[PDB]
Amino acid sequence: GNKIHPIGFRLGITRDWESRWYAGKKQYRHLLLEDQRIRGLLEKELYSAGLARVDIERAADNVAVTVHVAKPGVVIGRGGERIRVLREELAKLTGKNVALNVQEVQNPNLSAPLVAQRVAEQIERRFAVRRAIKQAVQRVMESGAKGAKVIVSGRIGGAEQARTEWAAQGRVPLHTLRANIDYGFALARTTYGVLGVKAYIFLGEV
Amino acid sequence: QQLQVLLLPKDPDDERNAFLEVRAGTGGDEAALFAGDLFRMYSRYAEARRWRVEIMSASEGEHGGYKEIIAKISGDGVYGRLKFESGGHRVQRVPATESQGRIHTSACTVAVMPELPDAELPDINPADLRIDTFRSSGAGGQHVNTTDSAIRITHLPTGIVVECQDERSQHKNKAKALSVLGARIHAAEMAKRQQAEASTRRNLLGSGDRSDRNRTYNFPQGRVTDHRINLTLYRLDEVMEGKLDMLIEPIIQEHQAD
Amino acid sequence: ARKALIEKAKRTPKFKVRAYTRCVRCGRARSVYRFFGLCRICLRELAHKGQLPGVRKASW
RNA sequence: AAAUGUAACA
RNA sequence: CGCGGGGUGGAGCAGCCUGGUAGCUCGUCGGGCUCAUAACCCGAAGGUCGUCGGUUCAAAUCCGGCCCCCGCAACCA
RNA sequence: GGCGACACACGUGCUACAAUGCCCACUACAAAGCGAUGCCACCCGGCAACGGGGAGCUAAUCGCAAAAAGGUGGGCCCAGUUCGGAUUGGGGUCUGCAACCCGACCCCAUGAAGCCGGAAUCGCUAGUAAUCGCGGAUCAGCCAUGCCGCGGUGAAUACG
RNA sequence: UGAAACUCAAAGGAAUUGACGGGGGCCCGCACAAGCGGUGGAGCAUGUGGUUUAAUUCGAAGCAACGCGAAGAACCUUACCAGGCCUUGACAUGCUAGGGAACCCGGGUGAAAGCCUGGGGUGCCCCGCGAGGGGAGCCCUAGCACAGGUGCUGCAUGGC
RNA sequence: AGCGCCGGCCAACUCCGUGCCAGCAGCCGCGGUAAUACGGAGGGCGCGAGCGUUACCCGGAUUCACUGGGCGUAAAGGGC
């Protein structure tokens, strides 16, 4: 058990923080806690939409939450029905002016956290884990990625002996700083236990 | 709660001090290792009740433990309490003598017997002797032909006879005859005594040494299960690394109802 | 004894000594950083995600 | 010139 | 019953005769080496000298009595 | 109340057994950090811990802050000592609702082992080892001689 | 010359991939050597084995467990022990029925918790010059689902 | 309307109980707290006034080889 997290390894090189603001010693914690509660609520409510990234900004008493998603409509609703419903649920928790945006995920099959959650859904539906993994990688490469690697660990198929299955195509140079690699993790809860899913998408090097 | 009158069956050797010996079984030095684990457990239990546990013979294990270990536990109600340890205790654990790392089912055996120190019963009571003075046989002179001085004694209760015809006088021939008669009385009674030891231990230690009675001590799960009755607790360490009073007690409570 | 303890740690005590930091994320009582409100494990988990503003792997 | 390591691998 | 030899740490033996000092080997124990055991290395503990009496300033030692052990003898009719 | 027990056993460390040293006085030279019921200048009371006053600083401004080894001068004279600072008695300080079990610090007295360590064994190839101090996280306080950092001084040796 | 009883689910040939060799060749690493400073001995600090204990909570086990989880155990922490207590409960989502909501303040008993109580004014949209009639802002009491478990299995697992 | 069977050979799978126990077994093998292999149940497969078992004969066995085998190292060249 070794490998470093591929995003934290690229923070400020190929990947940018998800909470971009400044705060002083006396304040940092409380903003961060509220920041995570925003993600807590949104991660549950926006799952069906296709949540990929949740960016957060702060100035002074006002905060702007940018939600990236594959199905923008599922967030907005009918003419703004759910999008309005969100600000109220939001600024109730926030207690401040909570500006909520939405933005497209141009290619959900090039978004690693999306690929990961899809396979995790597939394996909670009792699908053939190995067939799924080869498929997921096949989608990501067809969508143009320079390389892809997907991993599933746990009681695969219900087996008592845990195992790890992975498949990969193209290049995935996890040692190269300048290589842009999206990473995502998805938890698959089954009747026999938890399976872990990891998705690596190599978009290109910068 | 109407306490059921348990004062109907009597018991002779129920409060007497008890010998306790633990012997290794199936599984090489692993069972020897466990025979010490059973002995410390009975040592924790004896000292927890202010009992005198005194070892008299031990055979060390090749890699630590006890192939055999016999001790004398003295106190009040010793045998009447530990007499349910006699039998085969089964083990299931990851050995300390393991190379790969797999569960191994070894076993040990425990013998528990009362005190009843052996008596002497000697000095040959004469009222059971029939002394026969006659004449000798072989070399000599007129003395042999005439002087008798050939002796044979007969112990009626055992049937053991001895005649001595070595030296001339019958009194020096009776002296040897008396001492030999008692030597045969004692060697014959000491036979009937140690025959009763190997005949009771054989039906208490269980010749089979892997699948027999008593308890099985599983360490991976944490299950001490005594198969005699029908109760499987989870103390294990608590019972082993310490005393185990509330385990013997459900066995005695069911044996009472029997 | 866990959720009751992450709860008793929130309520103000009978004497100000009895107050102690728990990790707001996982409830850990040990190795709690004041600056974040998080334990060393959560501090590492969120930092690798990038959900700690300005925090990055320090190398010199 | 120097001995040994039993007995329950998915 | 005679004669003469013995009993000294857990085991096997010294030390007595020319009295003051009980020692050797194994074992036991703590520490090392080794993945671990043995082997090996370092350090240590351990003896009412069979019991009862006495000669002596002083007894494992010398002198008596008892208790066990070993060997020999017990012939002439 | 216990996690702090104590016939014993092992690991990791701290301080040492001293003169290339110890003590006292005076005097230099860092870095990296931390700090608004926080860091505290300076003043006064106390041998002191500390206390009472009180300025500054949302800190390249103010503060922790003196770095220590070193340098200069004096004392010690080879001794279980002016080495060593364990153990215990007594008297206080601070934190805290509360220091019996079970806190750190100061002061008076006490002043143990230890004279360089068996079998065995660890680290390090250059600003390294060795040695010297400074900071931080945790944190009311602290059992930190621990950990993560920071600079000062600065070697030996590598045939193979 | 040459059986049988009995017993086993194999005994075997060659070749393949490893692993190992007190086989060989060629290399590398503070691995040895060359050096410098230590550990093992002392006193102490700390972790552990043991033993002790009502409890001395638990995990970590050769290198790669042992100043490791513990980057702060007097209460708290705390998972252990003793004793005093609470029963939809310290905490979530619920439906139902009674109080008044909500918040703040004391009294009694007690080691405290708790148990027992004496205080005080509820917005709303509402018939409201009127008793009076609510909804649901939140609490309180009774209930039923449920909560809660640092209880076991790292040999069912994810993550690290 | 009953009997055998439902791990592989070999056609027919799940729940519970059990927890190297009780037991199954023709071979290989099952059972140590998620057992399609033990016991029951539901369901399924195969036959049906029968269905299974034991025994014995030929077959599969080109495993006594005439059809139709072999002997350097697998059993097997006699010492010449």
Ligand SMILES: [Mg+2]
């Ligand atoms: Mg024997």
Ligand SMILES: [Mg+2]
């Ligand atoms: Mg004759």
Ligand SMILES: [Mg+2]
């Ligand atoms: Mg005559």
Ligand SMILES: [Mg+2]
């Ligand atoms: Mg006559």
Ligand SMILES: [Mg+2]
């Ligand atoms: Mg509890």
Ligand SMILES: [Mg+2]
């Ligand atoms: Mg939990």
Ligand SMILES: [Mg+2]
């Ligand atoms: Mg605190």
Ligand SMILES: [Mg+2]
């Ligand atoms: Mg804390």
Ligand SMILES: [Mg+2]
């Ligand atoms: Mg001799």
Ligand SMILES: [Mg+2]
């Ligand atoms: Mg002799």
Ligand SMILES: [Mg+2]
């Ligand atoms: Mg020893």
Ligand SMILES: [Mg+2]
């Ligand atoms: Mg005498």
Ligand SMILES: [Mg+2]
């Ligand atoms: Mg003498």
Ligand SMILES: [Mg+2]
């Ligand atoms: Mg003659």
Ligand SMILES: [Mg+2]
């Ligand atoms: Mg306590």
Ligand SMILES: [Mg+2]
């Ligand atoms: Mg502890």
